[PDB]
Amino acid sequence: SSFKAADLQLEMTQKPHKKPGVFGKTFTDHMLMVEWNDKGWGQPRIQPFQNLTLHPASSSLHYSLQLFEGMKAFKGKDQQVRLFRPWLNMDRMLRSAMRLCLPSFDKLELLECIRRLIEVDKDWVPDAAGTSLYVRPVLIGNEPSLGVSQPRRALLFVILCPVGSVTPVSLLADPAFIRAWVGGVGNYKLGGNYGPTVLVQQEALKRGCEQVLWLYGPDHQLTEVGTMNIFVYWTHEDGVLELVTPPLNGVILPGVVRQSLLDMAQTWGEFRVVERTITMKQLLRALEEGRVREVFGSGTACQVAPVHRILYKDRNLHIPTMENGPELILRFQKELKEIQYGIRAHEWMFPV
Amino acid sequence: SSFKAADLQLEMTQKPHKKPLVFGKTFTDHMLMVEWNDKGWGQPRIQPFQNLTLHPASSSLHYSLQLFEGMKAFKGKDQQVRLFRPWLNMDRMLRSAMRLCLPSFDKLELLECIRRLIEVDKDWVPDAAGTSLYVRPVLIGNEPSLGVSQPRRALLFVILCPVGAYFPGGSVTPVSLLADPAFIRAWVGGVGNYKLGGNYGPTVLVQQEALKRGCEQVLWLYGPDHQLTEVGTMNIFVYWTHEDGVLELVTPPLNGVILPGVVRQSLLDMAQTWGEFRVVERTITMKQLLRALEEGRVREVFGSGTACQVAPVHRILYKDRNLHIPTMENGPELILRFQKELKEIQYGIRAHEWMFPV
Ligand SMILES: *Cc1c(COP(=O)(O)O)cnc(C)c1O
Ligand SMILES: *Cc1c(COP(=O)(O)O)cnc(C)c1O
């Protein structure tokens, strides 16, 4: 059925790594690990940070039967650690698992195991300004077989990273490259979605841009920004101030922060908050008519990323985000910072 | 620059096992292994069949920085092993590597390493009817980092499997296909035309959705006009009399959604050398097929891959309606011919430039 938090074994480290005096390069001393097979879910293990022992014909390495998740744990002023809406990360992880025919589990049980893991490495969580602990739960197929079938053996593991912007980012809008397709798997956080992006990412760095803007369809629809969802604060063609983000139709990943920004903006009710398709045509005109206020990306890595420049077909489009405050961005960050670092009590935060 | 066959180290096993079977579950005693890092390509290693030791943040397991290849080694009557057009598998592997920002290597050097590996496990190659050794070269990223970037560290390894007749007795069973346009394998400007693991993971759910609707494999439709692209892990062919009223063999052209199959190319080359009928690479729609079936113009529909050289198709389930494909009633002449000549070429009965001796 599922692994239990009650059966959790604790093997403490006898070779603890040095704490720092760089995103996802420094790792903590401990990692969660649960195996699945014909018999079912084994006992969950909090083991020291070891290497993985995989069969050369492991489905994870051959047919990309792999999925992951990204959520942050914030140590507040009272020095109590809290996870930001971890339930939505657990929801999206199970939806990913069912898509790749990997074993289903109890969401609340895995959360408790991740809670206990962070409890053990409690000292690894930084309490510095704009710093957190990045949680990386992973589920992979591990059947020793080259058959493209439902894996008989799987492996769920979690690893932690201490992590450390006021600066805006430049985007490359090249329609030649397609991240995901309607009826694809773009709306699941599967490794398969990322491998292809690495070439497109370095093609952006070599054209001056920092991150990629992913266009889809002949009408060149704005979908995502690298590993972030996209928002546009602007006065629409109807002449009404709205916040718009592409809707969940298969190409867009349902971001936890994306959903949090919509929920937060809806509760204000001060301006219109819609999920509608955004085309380059709409933006080029909106920029021409000076209707665009702020463009930004939302992810775990970057909570609210200001966008100042977009390179599209050898022409630089200046986005006037920073000239317009950026009001909405600074507001979102402020309230998120208050919620996350415990300054303001909220139902979203899950205490360790 | 690249690893060399001259620097190849040989660590022999000391526990050779089995030699009895099901596809890609039984493995040989030895495996090739070359590591890449900042310094560059290390010495290539023929080691015993061990497990892999990967960092928990290995790019291969997180961001699917992984690609593979599939080619067969055929032990002839003279008991000499030969690889079927291995150069094209090496070409497609390098094109895959460049797409995922993985290190480029010398194609001829890796082939020589794979040749030496099969030379060591020469006894593992079966000489039974319709049996071969399946070769599985793999290249993965192995940088201990959660950054979505070009991997600083990689790992190239090759493993071997003895495999059985896809069709026992020489006689061939046909397959049922599910044509559901709701599911999309690849997209134009995607990575469908590269043999990357990322392309396959999503197919497993669509494959079991076919099994539970009676069908055996999936037919992948693309676009609003419902273009026939691929069959599961095989390219698709249609032997028929076209609307112009001429007998032709047609397969979807290489435009990003189609993987350039070694066998696909081999069937085109072989049919072109005959010059007995028209051989074209043109888009095939369901409309064209539904009409061609209605007018009884369809002779044979089949899939081509390494696993299945020539797969007969007898049934296609499309919009909750079963389309009968008259492949088996028409011989199948072209299929049986293709298999016969391929079998003669591969098992050494007929000498050909395509075969590479071990
Ligand atoms: C991880 C990721 C995001 C961010 O997800 P959040 O839950 O909002 O942190 C956005 N887009 C893509 C493509 C991603 O992979
Ligand atoms: C692996 C694969 C094939 C087989 O390619 P060959 O080189 O002909 O063996 C065909 N189509 C798809 C989609 C594949 O993934």
Author numbering:
A (entry chain A): 3 to 23, 29 to 171, 178 to 365
B (entry chain B): 3 to 22, 28 to 365
Cite, word for word, the article reporting this structure:
Human branched-chain aminotransferase (hBCAT) is an enzyme that catalyzes the transamination of the branched-chain amino acids leucine, valine and isoleucine and α-ketoglutarate to their respective α-keto acids and glutamate. The hBCAT proteins are PLP-dependent enzymes and their reaction is accompanied by the interconversion of the cofactor pyridoxal 5′-phosphate (PLP) and pyridoxamine 5′-phosphate (PMP). It forms a homodimer, and the monomer of hBCAT is composed of a small domain (residues 1–170) and a large domain (residues 182–365) connected by an interdomain loop that contains 11 amino acids. The hBCAT CXXC center, which is unique among aminotransferases, lies adjacent to the active site and can be modified via oxidation, including S-glutathionylation or S-nitrosylation.
However, when the C318A mutant was oxidized by H2O2 to become a C318A/C315CSD mutant the transaminase activity was almost abolished, and this loss was irreversible, representing overoxidation of the redox sensor to sulfinic/sulfonic acid. In this study, we determined the crystal structure of the oxidized C318A mutant (C318A/C315CSD). The overall structure resembles the canonical hBCATm homodimer and contains a Schiff base-linked PLP in the active sites, which are located at the interface between the small and large domains of each monomer. The overall structure of the C318A/C315CSD variant overlays very well with that of the C318A mutant and the oxidized form of wild-type hBCATm, with a few exceptions in the interdomain loop (residues 171–181) and the N-terminal loop (residues 15–32). The interdomain loop, which was not interpretable in the structure of the C318A mutant owing to a lack of electron density, is interpreted in one of the monomers of the C318A/C315CSD structure, which overlays very well with the interdomain loop of the oxidized form of wild-type hBCAT. On the other hand, the N-terminal loop was not interpreted in either monomer of the C318A/C315CSD mutant, while the N-terminal loop was interpreted in only one of the monomers of the oxidized form of wild-type hBCATm and was interpreted in both monomers of the C318A mutant. In the structure, C318A and C315CSD follow the β-turn (residues 311–314) adjacent to the active site. Conformationally, they resemble the CXXC center of oxidized wild-type hBCATm, with the oxidized C315CSD having a similar orientation to the disulfide bridge in the oxidized wild type. For the CXXC center, it has previously been indicated that the dipole formed by Cys315 and Gly312 contributes to stabilizing the phosphate of the PLP ligand and the carboxylate of the incoming substrate.
